[PDB]
Amino acid sequence: AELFTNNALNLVIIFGSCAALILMSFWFRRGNRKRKGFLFHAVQFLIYTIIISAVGSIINYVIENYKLKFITPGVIDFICTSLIAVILTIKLFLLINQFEKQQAAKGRDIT
């Protein structure tokens, strides 16, 4: 009914993504090779993007089929884009801090 049609496929995709995320969380043991700034960061970014896309699709489909007391419902798309941007910025800042720590541990000018 409410979750039928595109909602069913979207829910299945989101459940599969959550299962993959949990599997990756289990896989992630300790840092060293396990923590990949260039690979784990991209994997997490893709996971967040897919999750936000699925949530936005579900919410939009529900609202359009039920109406909304607000103009431009796509504002939630803007919120999802902002969340993705902030997540990517946080990941980039963490990577930069890790690189700075690695350089300092090996010797580099402070300024």
Ligand SMILES: CCCCCCCCCCCC
């Ligand atoms: C665009 C591809 C970037 C690849 C970066 C590899 C980083 C390896 C670091 C190894 C440190 C010992």
